[PDB]
Design a protein around this nucleic acid. Sequence first.
DNA 1: CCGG
Lengths: 322, 321
Amino acid sequence: HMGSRSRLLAANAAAAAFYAQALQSDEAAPARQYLTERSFDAAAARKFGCGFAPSGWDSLTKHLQRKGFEFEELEAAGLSRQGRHGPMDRFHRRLLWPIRTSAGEVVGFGARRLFDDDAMEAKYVNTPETLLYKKSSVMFGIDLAKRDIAKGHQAVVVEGYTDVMAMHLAGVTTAVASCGTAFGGEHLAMLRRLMMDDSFFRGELIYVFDGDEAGRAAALKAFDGEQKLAGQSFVAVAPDGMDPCDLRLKCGDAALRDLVARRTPLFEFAIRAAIAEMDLDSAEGRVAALRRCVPMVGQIKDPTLRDEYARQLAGWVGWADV
Amino acid sequence: PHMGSRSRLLAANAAAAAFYAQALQSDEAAPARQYLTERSFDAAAARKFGCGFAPSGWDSLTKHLQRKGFEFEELEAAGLSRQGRHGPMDRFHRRLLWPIRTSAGEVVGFGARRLFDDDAMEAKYVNTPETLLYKKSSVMFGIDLAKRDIAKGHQAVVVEGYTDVMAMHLAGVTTAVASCGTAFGGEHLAMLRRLMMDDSFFRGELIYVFDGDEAGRAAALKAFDGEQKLAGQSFVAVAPDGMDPCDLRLKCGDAALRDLVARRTPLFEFAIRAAIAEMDLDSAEGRVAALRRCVPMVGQIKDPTLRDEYARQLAGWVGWA
DNA sequence: CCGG
């Protein structure tokens, strides 16, 4: 019993319920306000398991001790930690999102700052590295998205928790996000796995970015590795400044479906973005353009995909009929 | 053993290929050189694929290989020689040979084309029979060359003939392969599938290239059969006016072949539109009959996503219904 | 007094 995977999963399960309840308190008011300020209702908050870490030292810790859970289990789960005058909660006075497995089991939490006087000055904090929670492989929204990415042959990587919420609410049920860290290799590996039918990868990685420099960072990065999924990788970028949560407030739910639908392939975006910062209106800047982007084509390892982008260069700079 | 082993048999075929290659430069090998040069294959080409000529006579190669030390038991086992009444004799006579190899380049047999008018063998093409090395249902011409580019490019191009593979490779299509003697089956298909995975998780696009249309029909018919997993990744391309890839190169040059490949169609799309091509789209009552023939076909697609993408376009292909 |  003591400290098993199923025991820790039962603790995090108990903790999520407690935090979910705590969202309906008086001191939780600004946590609810954060949600409703960006158009998330009481239905939405319940759908994603949203909760409030209350004030005090050991609200949760005692709650789980009083329903059987020994402290040594709770520290290994990442819920509590050793304080000077005994045990205490990890999370305090913050809006929480339960981070689940694809099976739907809670392994940890993402917590946002609400109050100015909160000692923890970081904007977001997470459950630390545990047996269950692993930063580099865990994803928010994967429980809900699992079915529709396998069916849809499509994943939509977004930055934040509220960005996953806004996408899923707008119909884009394939949206997910990396929790407290950069999107990575074993995140990719996990999503790739679900999109397999037979022994064949099949689908679309759609990376949604906010701010165009953040998109251009992914662009210049696209040519780096073995370019394993590059052919099936795509970029969409919201109207300058915005993110999927904001886009849904200003321009409604349809604007997200279109943003996702009108994604650009990763290499195309990278190349054409470099052409965008050039003068295509003379013979000099036409040559300067090819002089920088033909090398980018040269780096493409798939000869099939390389030849496709070679064909479209003279079109994009201006030297031929598009 | 020492005599009649696998590596010994490969040595016999390797020798045989070297012998037949040399023989292509002979005087009586004029029409065999003519066959190649007539369809735009120069001396550089002929040496790449290892083209050769089987000489006139009875036991030309066999004697040459017996001088090299090979026993008759080995040469018969290799499918190079055979027992005639007054002694051993060659399998091939007075014919342009191409050696057929493994993916690692090891010669396992030959494909021979009829040249002369007074050839004893009536067949247009002859092959090495079933040996320890030569299995007709898994053997493919050009695989040694295409091996790499099929894996990296994630693309194979299946053509009908030897000259079609040659034409494709000279034209820059370095993913072209061909069946030898029999039609393209599952053991060929299942090998290229294995290959295009790239020792990994990759789906590659398999591109069939047909001369006429009965083949395109036969492939269109077979598109919907049983579990149809690799049918989704299969593609078809057909040359205009019923020409093979070799003659498409002769007349319309190397640019046609590369773009024939580029302008290939999905197998399902080809099959559906082939059926639409046999109906009167002029009247509005014809438009409706066409829609009615095709949603049964679209219905037979087992993948939901493909079906939806094919049911989408069905308006456009009917001429707006 | 070959083989196909």
